[PDB]
């Protein structure tokens, strides 16, 4: 909702409450999953060509008792945009690989989980410096590219570490050395085609015997396709990764091949059914694991839109992973899940 628009400054205050419940034989995901998100997007006109902006988004879980608080910052960044040249922003933001993979992250509840948060340059993460050029100086409609740098996020401070520390340090599964990446997308009418590449130094804390997938750098290569017209949405992405994909709590995959596909239709009366397939196939994993499925599921669901502010959905994760030693060791969910959600948003 735009709550302020005066003398060239605009402020949009937005959010949602998702009354949400999971049904699953897996009791670690089963039960109340209610949550809310809040955010703001602000923009200020500096000149006719130059605009400054900032965005912040926060998630607060609504499913805990009052003696605890489970909340986090999704994004927080400030930036400058110049008409027909580009933009730059810095902060917690999305990695440029997400420019392509976001195209299949459109499912009612699940999806978008061949990668995670704080996972090199694949999704949300800290310390992104992002440069973007839209429409190639305004001379090629629909063609966009981006180049991104990520600074090191290392070991926690004040915990007795003698190397690799940063002020905002964290556990090794969520660390990263310096990284660089890029994306190109082209959209003509309904069609879209895109590609992205990322390369991040891996830290010493990540390259210990306690984690599978030791390596100097984490690399990702992504291609994507999209069709979005005539009430039909189709998209697919394929990603090859090296020492970049987490294998639950075990560490990372030496190599992984990720694939996601989605098909959706929008009825006039407000119903939007969705069908999707995701898989992540790991190779040469180490410790005798060899080749294993990290993720494999079919997602069938539907959303009903009452209007732009109220909707309800059901999403059914038909989980094709089988319960074995590998998935047990990594703590990967192999059970089906049904989600039922009712969402108010502004």
Give the start-to-end residue ranges of the domains of the chain. Answer: 1-346
Q: Find how far residue 133's CA is from the centre of its chain.
A: 21
Homologous superfamily assigned to 1-346: Porin (2.40.160.10)
Which residues make beta-bridge pairs with 206?
Answer: none
Contact 237, 277 (CB under 8 A): no
**CA gap 316, 111 in Å, rounded:** 11
173 assigned to a ligand binding site: no
Report the run of H or E that residue 64 belongs to, with start and end. Answer: none
Length of the chain, please?
346
Resolution in A: 19.0
**CA gap 210, 289 in Å, rounded:** 15
Hey, is 190 helix, strand or coil?
Answer: coil
Q: Which of 155, 206, 154, 199 is nearest to 179 (CA)?
A: 199
**CA gap 8, 2 in Å, rounded:** 13
DSSP state of 160: -
**CA gap 226, 115 in Å, rounded:** 19
CB atoms within 10 A of CB 268: 6
The sign of the CA dihedral 29, 315, 224, 58 is negative
CB atoms within 10 A of CB 6: 7
Q: Is 28 buried (19+), middle (13-18) or exposed (0-12) by CB count in 10 A? A: exposed
**CA gap 116, 250 in Å, rounded:** 15
CB atoms within 10 A of CB 256: 27
Contact 297, 321 (CB under 8 A): yes
**CA gap 187, 227 in Å, rounded:** 9
Experimentally, the structure was elucidated by cryo-EM
319 assigned to a ligand binding site: yes
321 assigned to a ligand binding site: yes
């Amino acid at each position: 909702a735009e709550v302020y628009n005066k003398d060239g400054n605009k402020l949009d205050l937005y959010g949602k409450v998702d009354g949400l419940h999971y049904f699953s034989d897996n009791k670690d995901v089963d039960g109340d999953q209610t949550y809310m998100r809040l955010g703001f997007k602000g923009e200020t006109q500096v000149t006719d060509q130059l605009t400054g902006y900032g965005q912040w988004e926060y998630q607060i879980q609504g499913n805990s008792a009052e003696n605890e608080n489970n909340s986090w910052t999704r994004v927080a960044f400030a930036g400058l945009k110049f008409q027909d040249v580009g933009s730059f922003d810095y902060g917690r933001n999305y990695g440029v690989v997400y420019d392509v993979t976001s195209w299949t992250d459109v499912l009612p509840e699940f999806g978008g989980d061949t990668y995670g948060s704080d996972n090199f340059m694949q999704q949300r993460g800290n310390g992104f410096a992002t440069y973007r050029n839209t429409d190639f100086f305004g001379l090629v409609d629909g063609l966009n590219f981006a180049v991104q740098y990520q600074g090191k996020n290392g070991n926690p401070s004040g915990e007795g570490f003698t190397s690799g520390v940063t002020n905002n340090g964290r556990d090794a599964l969520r660390q990263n050395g310096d990284g660089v990446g890029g994306s190109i997308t082209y959209d003509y009418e309904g069609f879209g085609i895109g590609g992205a590449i990322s390369s991040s130094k891996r830290t010493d804390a990540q390259n210990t015997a306690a984690y599978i997938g030791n390596g100097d750098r984490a690399e990702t290569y992504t291609g994507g396709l999209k069709y979005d017209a005539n009430n039909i949405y189709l998209a697919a992405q394929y990603t090859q990764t090296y020492n970049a994909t987490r294998v639950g709590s075990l560490g990372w995959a030496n190599k992984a091949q990720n694939f996601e596909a989605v098909a959706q239709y929008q009825f006039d009366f407000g119903l939007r059914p969705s069908l999707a397939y995701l898989q992540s196939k790991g190779k040469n994993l180490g410790r005798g694991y060899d080749d294993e499925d990290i993720l494999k599921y079919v997602d069938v669901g539907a959303t009903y839109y009452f209007n732009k502010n109220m909707s309800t959905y059901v999403d059914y994760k038909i989980n094709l992973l089988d319960d074995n030693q590998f998935t047990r060791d990594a703590g990967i969910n192999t059970d089906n899940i049904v989600a039922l959600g009712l969402v108010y948003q502004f």
